[PDB]
């Protein structure tokens, strides 16, 4: 997570007055299925 609260930042040639705020969330995800035969799935239609 990053966060640039409004103030001295955003303050940039885009926004000299610096009136914008920013918060970011980044992450990494990945998985591997060792034994697909160990995973069972049934499909159906309910009411």
């Amino acid at each position: 997570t990053y966060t640039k609260k409004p103030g001295i930042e955003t303050v940039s040639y885009a926004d000299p007055y610096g009136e914008m705020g920013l918060t970011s969330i980044k992450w990494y995800y990945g998985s591997l299925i060792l034994r697909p035969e160990w995973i069972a799935l049934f499909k159906t239609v309910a009411a």
Binding site: A14, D15, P16, Y17, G18, M20
Partner: protein, 46 residues
Amino acid sequence: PALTENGGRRVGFTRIQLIGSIKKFGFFYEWTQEAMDFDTDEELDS
């Protein structure tokens, strides 16, 4: 000016130049010796 809540976009400044000049000036006069010797006044030079 009108700063909207968004912001993002100005004023400038200028300076001007003043120029002077130096000009030469002067004059002169002449006199003969006889003017000084044969003058009614003896303090004409002064």
